[PDB]
Amino acid sequence: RFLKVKNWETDVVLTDTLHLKSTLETGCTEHICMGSIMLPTKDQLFPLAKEFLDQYYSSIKRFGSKAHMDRLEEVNKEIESTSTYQLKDTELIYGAKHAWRNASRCVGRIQWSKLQVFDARDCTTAHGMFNYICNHVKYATNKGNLRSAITIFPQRTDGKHDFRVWNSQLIRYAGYKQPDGSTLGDPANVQFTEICIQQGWKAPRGRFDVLPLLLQANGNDPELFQIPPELVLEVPIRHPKFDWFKDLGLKWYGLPAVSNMLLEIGGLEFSACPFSGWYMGTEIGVRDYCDNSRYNILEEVAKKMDLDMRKTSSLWKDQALVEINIAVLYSFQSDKVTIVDHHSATESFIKHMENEYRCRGGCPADWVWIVPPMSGSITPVFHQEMLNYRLTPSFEYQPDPWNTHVW
Amino acid sequence: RFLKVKNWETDVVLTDTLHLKSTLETGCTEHICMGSIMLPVRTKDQLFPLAKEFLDQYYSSIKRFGSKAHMDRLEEVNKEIESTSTYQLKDTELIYGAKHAWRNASRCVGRIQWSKLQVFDARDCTTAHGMFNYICNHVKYATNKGNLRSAITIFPQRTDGKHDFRVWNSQLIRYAGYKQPDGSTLGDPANVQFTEICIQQGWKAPRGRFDVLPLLLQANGNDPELFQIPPELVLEVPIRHPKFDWFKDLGLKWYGLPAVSNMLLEIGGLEFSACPFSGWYMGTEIGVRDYCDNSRYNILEEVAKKMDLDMRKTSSLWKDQALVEINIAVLYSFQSDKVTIVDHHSATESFIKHMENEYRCRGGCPADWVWIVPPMSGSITPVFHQEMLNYRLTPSFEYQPDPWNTHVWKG
Ligand code: HEM
Ligand code: HEM
Ligand SMILES: CNCCN(C)c1cc(C#N)cc(CCc2cc(C)cc(N)n2)c1
Ligand SMILES: CNCCN(C)c1cc(C#N)cc(CCc2cc(C)cc(N)n2)c1
Ligand SMILES: C[C@H](O)[C@H](O)[C@H]1CNc2nc(N)[nH]c(=O)c2N1
Ligand SMILES: C[C@H](O)[C@H](O)[C@H]1CNc2nc(N)[nH]c(=O)c2N1
Numbered sequence: 001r002f003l004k005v006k007n008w009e010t011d012v013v014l015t016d017t018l019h020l021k022s023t024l025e026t027g028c029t030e031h032i033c034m035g036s037i038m039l040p041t042k043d044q045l046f047p048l049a050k051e052f053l054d055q056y057y058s059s060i061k062r063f064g065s066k067a068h069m070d071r072l073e074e075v076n077k078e079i080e081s082t083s084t085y086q087l088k089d090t091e092l093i094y095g096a097k098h099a100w101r102n103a104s105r106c107v108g109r110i111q112w113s114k115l116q117v118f119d120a121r122d123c124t125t126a127h128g129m130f131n132y133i134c135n136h137v138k139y140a141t142n143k144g145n146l147r148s149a150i151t152i153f154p155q156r157t158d159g160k161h162d163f164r165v166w167n168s169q170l171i172r173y174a175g176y177k178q179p180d181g182s183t184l185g186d187p188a189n190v191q192f193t194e195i196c197i198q199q200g201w202k203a204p205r206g207r208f209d210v211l212p213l214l215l216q217a218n219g220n221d222p223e224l225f226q227i228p229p230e231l232v233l234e235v236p237i238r239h240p241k242f243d244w245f246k247d248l249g250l251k252w253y254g255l256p257a258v259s260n261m262l263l264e265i266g267g268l269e270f271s272a273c274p275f276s277g278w279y280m281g282t283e284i285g286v287r288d289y290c291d292n293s294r295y296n297i298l299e300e301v302a303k304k305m306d307l308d309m310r311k312t313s314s315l316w317k318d319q320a321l322v323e324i325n326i327a328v329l330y331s332f333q334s335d336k337v338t339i340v341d342h343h344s345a346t347e348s349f350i351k352h353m354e355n356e357y358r359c360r361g362g363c364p365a366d367w368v369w370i371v372p373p374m375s376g377s378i379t380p381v382f383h384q385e386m387l388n389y390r391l392t393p394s395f396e397y398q399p400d401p402w403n404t405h406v407w
Numbered sequence: 408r409f410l411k412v413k414n415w416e417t418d419v420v421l422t423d424t425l426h427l428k429s430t431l432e433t434g435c436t437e438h439i440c441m442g443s444i445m446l447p448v449r450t451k452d453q454l455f456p457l458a459k460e461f462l463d464q465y466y467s468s469i470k471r472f473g474s475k476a477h478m479d480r481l482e483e484v485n486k487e488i489e490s491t492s493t494y495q496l497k498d499t500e501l502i503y504g505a506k507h508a509w510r511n512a513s514r515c516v517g518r519i520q521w522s523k524l525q526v527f528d529a530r531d532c533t534t535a536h537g538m539f540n541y542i543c544n545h546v547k548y549a550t551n552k553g554n555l556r557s558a559i560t561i562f563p564q565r566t567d568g569k570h571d572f573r574v575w576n577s578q579l580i581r582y583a584g585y586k587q588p589d590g591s592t593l594g595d596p597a598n599v600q601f602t603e604i605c606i607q608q609g610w611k612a613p614r615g616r617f618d619v620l621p622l623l624l625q626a627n628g629n630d631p632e633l634f635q636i637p638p639e640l641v642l643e644v645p646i647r648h649p650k651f652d653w654f655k656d657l658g659l660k661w662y663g664l665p666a667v668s669n670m671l672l673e674i675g676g677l678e679f680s681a682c683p684f685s686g687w688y689m690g691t692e693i694g695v696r697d698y699c700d701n702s703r704y705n706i707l708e709e710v711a712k713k714m715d716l717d718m719r720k721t722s723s724l725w726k727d728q729a730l731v732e733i734n735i736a737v738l739y740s741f742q743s744d745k746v747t748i749v750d751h752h753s754a755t756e757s758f759i760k761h762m763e764n765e766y767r768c769r770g771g772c773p774a775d776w777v778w779i780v781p782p783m784s785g786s787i788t789p790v791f792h793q794e795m796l797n798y799r800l801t802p803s804f805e806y807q808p809d810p811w812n813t814h815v816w817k818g
């Protein structure tokens with residue numbers, strides 16, 4: 001019932017008690033581990049509210065106080081009467097920070113308490129959503145000195161009035177299939193890119209076209225908006241040693257901003273809750289640049305390095321991979337845009353885990369996602385046992401809206 | 408019930424039904440995933456169902472399920488259990504058993520090869536000297552002058568738990584580790600405790616950076632005895648780099664034969680506590696783990712120095728750079744000396760083809776993603792993108808506690 005995790009590099013053993021407060025299910029059973037699978041009413045609501053308000057009043061050292069009891073009372077009355085309830089600003093902020101704190105797949109969580117929360121619960125239209133999002137983008141970007149932020153649109157009601165950002169990230173590049181059979185730009189967004197086209201976006205049909213926002217307010221049909229280009233900070237990618245690198249014509253955007261997730265707080269569902277921080281270098285250089293189903297540039301780079309691409313055992317892919325990742329880091333650093341390398345981020349995460357074990361009794365962590373996609377075992381997270389479990393408040397996956405929405 | 412796995416690079420979706428045959432626990436529950444946790448005497452009572460389940464599997468595999476031969480064998484094993492409280496495997500069942508434990512080994516990327524395993528039956532062995540002889544023969548056979556052949560040697564099964572056969576070494580071939588009075592380590596830090604035991608038992612330590620350890624062998628619950636493997640039988644590869652001529656002067660070598668000797672083989676409820684097995688290396692085991700773990704040889708610094716990389720900030724990715732070169736060097740050295748080795752790209756591609764074949768022919772392939780994905784360049788290998796299901800099938804290889812922690816000393 002009380003569980004131990006060991007670091008095999010340092011022998012440090014930590015004891016996890018926080019898991020016993022776990023709520024949602026993992027996908028695993030005693031017979032089958034699903035650790036590597038990517039996606040495994042009035043009655044129901046008050047226990048959820050109570051569990052949340054209990055953790056909130058505990059956090060501000062007011063558990064069992066009149067104000068605690070009075071709020072539980074007030075929320076109970078409001079659910080009984082309205083079928084839902086509204087969070088106080090203080091609860092909203094606490095909830096959103098804790099959803100990040102509880103994100104088991106996030107290596108960046110040492111930062112969890114410095115999150116700027118933008119309350120957009122007064123928003124009613126897609127133009128309003130566009131405005132909130134431009135403001136979030138500019139605040140977070142901060143001329144390259146990135147600051148973590150979340151913007152929270154109105155919560156789900158009857159479920160026919162959902163607010164949604166259809167984009168998977170606030171800032172992403174277009175993808176287009178051609179007669180050629182291949183793909184121009186980002187192949188991950190081909191479908192979304194065409195949804196934008198079929199909605200009326202005039203695509204410049206290039207390799208790095210910032211997609212328009214497709215915003216859905218109050219369950220209405222989503223609408224298109226171009227983010228002011230002056231708000232989209234982008235970085236040209238060069239290498240500190242290879243002068244030819246720049247001629248590949250690679251660039252990426254400074255702001256990583258997930259916009260398709262659902263934020264659950266005290267049983268309330270916030271279906272539009274875009275959040276952003278700053279990149280770990282490997283996200284762009286390993287995943288975005290080198291995944292076979294992404295920009296897939298390994299082959300071209302290896303060629304310019306004149307490596308032996310004859311046999312896999314020359315490790316030409318591995319060599320190119322490192323160089324590409326050195327370039328990403330160097331470019332962001334040169335242009336004074338916040339970025340973290342995988343060594344620095346994973347070391348910070350170990351220190352964070354230790355804080356959380358010490359101060360909270362644990363830290364839910366998903367090893368499959370935490371260990372970087374390159375140089376795994378030379379980062380300390382590789383040797384760290386982690387327990388994965390689901391706490392609330394949380395960020396959850398939700399279905400893509402084009403399958404759900406009724407036009 | 409059916410379970411699907413998706414490859415996120417190819418969108419290929421596979422369907423697992425084999426998990427229905429899973430028995431042992433994972434350590435996970437609906438409330439906690441223990442997927443990254445490293446380590447998560449029988450009665451007649453529990454033994455006959457385990458025997459029956461095994462023999463049903465064996466007999467189906469030979470297309471003789473429900474045959475007279477099948478039935479007579481069940482009855483013979485049954486009678487043997489109630490009479491002697493255990494039973495003996497026929498040679499054919501032992502071979503099938505050992506091949507299947509490998510096939511079922513979810514942490515093993517090399518399983519495409521599972522059906523080519525040379526099984527050496529050492530169940531007539533009675534003494535530590537007898538074990539030494541069997542292990543020498545296994546090493547010579549598996550080494551095959553560099554043309555490595557997979558093998559397992561299987562000593563007598565557990566009886567009352569008081570007469571266990573054990574190989575105390577964790578691998579048949581491994582280098583000594585010595586902790587110095589100043590706190591530094593000479594040789595392999597992983598093997599310090601084991602090296603000290605060997606020393607206490609009377610091994611004369613050369614005290615260098617690459618001293619091949621003696622074998623410490625326990626037969627029939629007796630105190631273990633030391634033996635030196637003939638050096639002519641220990642194939643080693645000096646490590647050099649195809650382009651960096653200073654790489655050789657780092658003084659590195661490694662042995663060619665990876666041979667796990669501390670696991671327990673379970674077949675039909677029987678426990679084979681000494682079952683050393685061997686294959687050939689994937690380059691990263693040596694180049695990433697053995698050489699570059701901080702708690703192992705830890706050569707990243709000295710290598711990066713000699714490459715004149717910028718070591719002042721981690722964001723230069725100097726460690727990543729030194730890491731790749733070292734791994735190039737390991738593969739180059741092995742290939743140049745004609746010693747079997749596989750790179751992590753080749754090995755993972757073959758694993759995916761194996762895994763797909765297994766889904767089609769067997770209904771599944773249990774796989775531990777945490778172990779299967781290589782410890783460098785994870786996402787540029789196809790396994791990173793492959794969803795896997797981890798579950799436990801028998802026959803199986805299992806961990807067991809280190810014998811110095813449990814052995815009753817005779818004197
Ligand atoms: C401060 C800089 C941050 C860094 C360096 C960071 C790091 C990362 C990395 C490397 C991943 C894996 C992403 C992938 O492979 O797709 C990740 C996932 C995640 N992060 Fe963080 N993060 C940061 C800020 C945040 C913030 C501010 C939040 C929420 C407010 C957050 C919540 C999550 C969630 C929910 C996931 C999983 C998303 C999914 O499952 O696709 N991150 N983060
Ligand atoms: C044929 C060449 C082979 C290759 C390239 C191969 C590859 C590997 C690798 C890379 C690991 C992870 C090792 C570690 O990190 O400690 C492993 C684990 C394993 N392999 Fe294979 N293997 C091969 C043959 C075999 C054979 C012949 C058996 C038994 C018959 C076997 C059974 C296992 C077991 C039981 C584990 C888990 C070890 C543990 O949990 O510590 N392997 N193998
Ligand atoms: C799905 N994961 C692999 C591809 N990568 C690297 C990836 C894809 C998408 C999308 N859509 C989004 C991300 C961003 C994840 C993230 C979020 C935040 C707040 C910060 C950060 N550094 N990364 C990363
Ligand atoms: C414990 N895992 C990391 C250290 N490594 C790489 C490691 C430690 C020990 C031991 N003892 C043994 C091995 C060899 C595992 C193995 C076995 C076989 C049959 C083939 C193969 N390629 N590797 C590897
Ligand atoms: C199948 C496997 O779970 C999938 O490839 C995962 C592995 N680990 C990951 N880790 C991170 N951080 N991000 C990812 O997208 C993935 N993809
Ligand atoms: C804590 C974590 O499970 C541990 O470091 C694992 C990770 N993956 C591994 N994978 C392999 N092949 N071998 C290992 O020793 C490990 N170690």
Ligand SMILES: [Zn+2]
Nearest residue numbers: 028033435440
């Ligand atoms: Zn699990």
